[PDB]
A paper describes a structure:
The TBC1D23 protein functions in membrane trafficking and is critical for human neuronal development. Unlike many members of the TBC family, TBC1D23 lacks the catalytic Arg-Gln residues and unlikely functions as an active GAP.
After screening many different expression constructs, we were able to obtain diffraction-quality crystals of the TBC1D23 N-terminal region (D23N) consisting of residues 1–460 and encompassing both the TBC and rhodanese domains. The crystal structure of D23N was determined by selenium single-wavelength anomalous diffraction (Se-SAD) and refined to a resolution of 2.5 Å. The TBC and rhodanese domains tightly pack against each other and bury a total solvent-accessible surface area of 1,350 Å2. The two domains together adopt a V-shaped structure, with the TBC domain forming the base and one arm and the rhodanese domain the other arm. Similar to other TBC-containing proteins, the TBC domain of TBC1D23 only compromises α-helices, which can be further divided into two subdomains: the amino-terminal domains containing α1–α7 and a carboxy-terminal subdomain spanning α8–α16. The rhodanese domain of TBC1D23 adopts α/β topology typical of a single rhodanese domain. In contrast with CDC25B, the putative active-site cysteine residue C399 is localized in the middle of β2 strand of the β-sheet, and its side chain is solvent-inaccessible. Thus, our structural analysis indicates that the rhodanese domain of TBC1D23 is unlikely to be an active phosphatase or sulfurtransferase.
Residue numbers in the entry: 17 to 460
């Protein structure tokens, strides 16, 4: 029924991905129409060949190392060897021209070969093979993925958000995401998964067109191995990493439906800030210069933009809601504070630990009653806010440490603290929410 509609819709019109998506509705793609929907998904309907203009032979200082890796793939697949040479020439030319067109130099640790595997299986011409690979690389593959930088820090923060206990174990044994999930992100599972299940993943992924979805897919794969990771404490660091690497290869075609539904579920319990404040990972690096003093290397937990805090709580429609915790001293708090925020005086932490403990007990009770009441203040997700000044906000380290050690899920920090709150409201000229009788910031 929908397949004939898809057939005709793809033929003529030059329709967008959005309309195409409405036809399929997450149903399995026909093999003969998979190339066209993938093309449309990657926004390469009639892009021209860039290899013809090149008119160059494969010459590079690291050309020898490229040749071996290309053969390994074709040797692994073992295609009909009459027209195997054709594919080798196309693959090796694509990599070299990409290495030339861009400044970057080739290495074996790159996951470039694995990205081509599912595209090669569709069996497109060299032109479309490059355009697809080029498109995927700037859309859905992080720039700093190769070096193992910010992209894996973001994943660590997600793991900590939803699975504190697991994250803590991994951090303790110094098993960072880059160790086991390098090729997860680099290849979009194409390194480990079989052609059939890789295709099923890539079908849904390209249709959805969400760069950060990989994080949620990767999370599910990791969470599925939670039991195994924690139970055994006998195996060495290297032995556990080895196991984790090949967890995606254990997937089957009937697992994929649940993988996506679970990814979307964990996504629905994750702040919008996760995506919105980290667009600089996929595009150019030049964007994200504006976000000064917001390094994921230095981050202890996920950072929430003040805008989301004010918006999210007003909705009250089974979404992500925040219980805001002002962590500043009583002097700063009383001068001006968010009117829906619990006051956790960070001065108590060291000076009177007993009264701080009582204050933490009150906090959790207040969060509970605020959720039950269905008030503007109530929310599952703990978001701690300081001054916003880097001079003062060391106590945030110790506050966050206190809750993280007790494996509290949904622990976040307010991006730019109370200073960013004042600035945000000042910028948009808003005093309070629409419904109610009070301003956001009060002196009592």
């Amino acid at each position: 029924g929908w397949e004939k509609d898809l057939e005709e819709a793809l033929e003529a019109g030059g329709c967008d991905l959005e309309t195409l998506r409405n036809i399929i509705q997450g149903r399995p793609l026909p093999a003969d129409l998979r190339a066209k929907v993938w093309k449309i998904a990657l926004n390469v309907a009639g892009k021209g060949d860039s290899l013809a203009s090149w008119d160059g032979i494969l010459d590079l200082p690291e050309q020898n190392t490229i040749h071996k890796d290309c053969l390994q793939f074709i040797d692994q697949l073992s295609v009909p060897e009459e027209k195997a040479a054709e594919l080798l020439l196309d693959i090796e030319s694509v990599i070299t021209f990409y290495c030339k067109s861009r400044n970057i130099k080739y290495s074996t640790s790159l996951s470039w070969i694995h990205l081509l595997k599912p595209l090669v299986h569709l069996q497109l011409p060299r032109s479309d093979l490059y355009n697809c690979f080029y498109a995927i690389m700037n859309k859905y593959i992080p720039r700093d993925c190769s070096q193992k930088g910010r992209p894996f820090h973001l994943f660590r923060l997600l793991i900590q958000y939803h699975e504190p206990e697991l994250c803590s174990y991994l951090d303790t044994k110094k098993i960072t995401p880059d160790s086991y999930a390098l090729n997860w992100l680099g290849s979009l599972f194409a390194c480990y998964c079989s052609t059939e299940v890789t295709q099923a993943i890539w079908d849904g992924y390209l249709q959805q067109a969400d760069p950060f979805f990989i994080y949620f897919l990767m999370l599910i794969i990791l969470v599925n191995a939670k039991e195994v990771i924690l139970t055994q404490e006998s195996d060495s660091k290297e032995e556990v990493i080895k196991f984790l690497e090949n967890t995606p290869s254990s997937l089957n075609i009937e697992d994929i439906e649940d993988l996506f539904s679970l990814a979307q579920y964990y996504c629905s319990k994750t702040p919008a800030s996760f995506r919105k404040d980290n667009h600089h990972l996929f595009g150019s690096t030049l964007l994200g210069i504006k976000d000064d003093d917001a390094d994921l290397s230095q981050a202890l937990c996920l950072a929430i933009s003040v805008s989301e805090i004010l918006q999210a709580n007003q909705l009250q429609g089974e979404g992500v809601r925040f219980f805001v915790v002002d962590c500043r001293p009583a002097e700063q708090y009383n001068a001006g504070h968010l009117s829906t925020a619990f006051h956790l005086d960070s001065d108590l932490m060291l000076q009177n630990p007993s009264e701080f403990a009582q204050s933490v007990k009150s906090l959790l009770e207040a969060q509970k009653q605020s959720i039950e009441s269905g008030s503007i203040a109530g929310g599952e997700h703990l978001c701690f806010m300081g001054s916003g000044r880097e001079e003062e906000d060391m106590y945030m380290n110790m506050v966050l440490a206190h809750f993280l050690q007790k494996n509290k899920e949904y622990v976040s920090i307010a991006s730019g603290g109370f200073m960013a709150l004042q600035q945000h409201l000042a910028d948009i000229n808003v005093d309070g929410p629409e419904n109610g009788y009070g301003h956001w910031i009060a002196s009592t």
